[PDB]
């Protein structure tokens, strides 16, 4: 099929800072790869991102009652849904499954998989000596099923007997998870 | 501390397709299957703590449809640029032989959201146990999508996430194999 396509998008976004102390609501309308109108809770009304969205902004901002309910959506919609789901979204705590294995003898990788949230802290140690030279991380990978994974690689392989230690500090555990790797 | 909750909907023409879902820091909470008028929770545990009526999302798609047809005539029927997708094939965890895992096909940075995703095992399509998400939103207004093939890792099988998008010329095949 070679017919032209036309796409329309609509997003409502709630931003939480320090629990529910500061809440920012961002509603966006996207037509064909380009945002055209947006609502910002800080601004408190619709702003035309482009000239395509200009008629929408002058139209939606002219409805008083729906703007008040959209400003108040920090409480009735953002704060409410935060309390509804914080027991399984914010307070969700899934322990990382940490394992180590050497690729091919270098680039020692520490697999931090199946954890939540994504605020991970991976540090490499050489018998207590925190090695920061050869550390390379692939990044924070999102699996789409409320989990995360991350591979952190340490370039410098040691001599025999130098026990490298991958320490993982995650909000799900108070005592950091340490998985040690031995040498030749 | 920073947390984001997103409710994302879209409507597409002339395929006449729609969507409605909820997002938390880039992870989906629930979506509604308008054909069955049922609320589907991304994880089954989420239904025991909260409830959403799928009936209310019908009126949102009916507004998304009428919005798209107004924007089409306004832009002088300017077609969307068929941006080809970047496709990554991941796994849920480090893989081991004869130990269940989940192949993940991360289809990223594409528009419009029409993709013919097909899991191919040694060249033939597979639908046994195949799961998928909905078109997940993005900051750059492109789309993400996850397709899951619960599979038993082995060295005798190879897998392809054949992705067909109108921004390509031939089907996009991203390979995966063990070791």
């Amino acid at each position: 099929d070679t017919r032209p396509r036309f796409l329309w998008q609509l997003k409502f976004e709630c931003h939480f800072f320090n629990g529910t102390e500061r809440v920012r609501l961002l509603e966006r309308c996207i037509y064909n790869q380009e945002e055209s109108v947006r609502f910002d809770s800080d601004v408190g009304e619709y702003r035309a991102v482009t000239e395509l969205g200009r008629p929408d902004a002058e139209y939606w901002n002219s409805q008083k009652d729906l703007l008040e309910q959209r400003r108040a959506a920090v409480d009735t919609y953002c704060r409410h849904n935060y309390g509804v789901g914080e027991s399984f979204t914010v307070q969700r705590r899934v322990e990382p499954k940490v394992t180590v294995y050497p690729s091919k003898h270098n680039l020692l990788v520490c697999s931090v998989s199946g954890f939540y949230p994504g605020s991970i802290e991976v540090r490499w140690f050489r018998n207590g000596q925190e090695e920061k030279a050869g550390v390379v991380s692939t990044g924070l990978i999102q699996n789409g099923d409320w989990t995360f994974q991350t591979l952190v690689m340490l370039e410098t392989v040691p001599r025999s007997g130098e026990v490298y230690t991958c320490q993982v500090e995650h909000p799900s555990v108070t005592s950091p998870l340490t998985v040690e790797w031995r040498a030749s | 501390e920073e947390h984001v909750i997103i409710q994302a909907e879209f409507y597409l023409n002339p395929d006449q397709s729609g969507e409605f879902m909820f997002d938390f820091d880039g992870d989906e909470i629930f979506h509604v299957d308008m054909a069955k008028k049922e609320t589907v929770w991304r994880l089954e545990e989420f239904g025991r703590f909260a409830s959403f009526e799928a009936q209310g999302a019908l009126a949102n798609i009916a507004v998304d449809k009428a919005n798209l047809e107004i924007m089409t005539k306004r832009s002088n029927y300017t077609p969307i640029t068929n941006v080809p997708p970047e496709v990554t094939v991941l796994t849920n965890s480090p893989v081991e032989l004869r130990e269940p895992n989940v192949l993940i096909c991360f289809i990223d940075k594409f528009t419009p959201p029409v993709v013919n995703v097909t899991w191919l095992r040694n060249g033939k399509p597979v639908t046994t146990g195949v799961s998928e998400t909905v078109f997940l939103p993005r900051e750059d207004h492109l789309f993400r999508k996850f397709h899951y093939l619960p599979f038993l890792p082995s060295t005798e099988d190879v897998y392809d996430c054949r992705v067909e998008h109108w921004g390509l010329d031939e089907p996009l095949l991203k390979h995966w194999e063990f070791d």
Partner: antibody
Amino acid sequence: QVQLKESGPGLVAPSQSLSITCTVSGFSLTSYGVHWVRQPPGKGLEWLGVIWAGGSINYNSALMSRLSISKDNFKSQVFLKMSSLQTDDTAMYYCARAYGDYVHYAMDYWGQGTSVT
Amino acid sequence: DIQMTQSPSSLSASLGQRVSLTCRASQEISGYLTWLQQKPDGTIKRLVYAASTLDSGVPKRFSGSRSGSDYSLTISSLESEDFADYYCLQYTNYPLTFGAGTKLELK
């Protein structure tokens, strides 16, 4: 982060052989393709060729029979060559990055530029 | 060979003013256009690709657009580092052809 760096000799005597090298960091060439562009001093840009992540190379018809593009994924560097030099080859030589193996993936990140006169 | 005609060759404007750079092709390019900026130092940076998709590390004052066969790059307000050279680029099919270019000058 993603960076591209062009290096090459600046002295180009007439009717000689030219070679330019582009070095990239922050990504892999097995997943991205490298374009080549040049710019005469004080004038516009001209696309020369491109090599994709799979290895397919597409040169320019006007400058074909002279251009040559190669790669080395392990060394993460790109190469350009232009035989039979002349006075209009005086320009700045650049490289850029594009994803995948198809022409509809746009180029994203540029280098700084090497000079020949 | 698709021929790109970048409408302005040189533009002079002060800071905080709206400017538009129009690029037109001789054929149908299916919206595959990339916009570029070249600062007087000589470095080149992408602003918009696919003719409407802003790049990640770009200020929100750069907008891409398409209307039939006429493409554009719009700067809503001009800062001090915006005065540079700009080149459009079509990539729908080989050979890739740039426009002649536009030089942005501080009036």
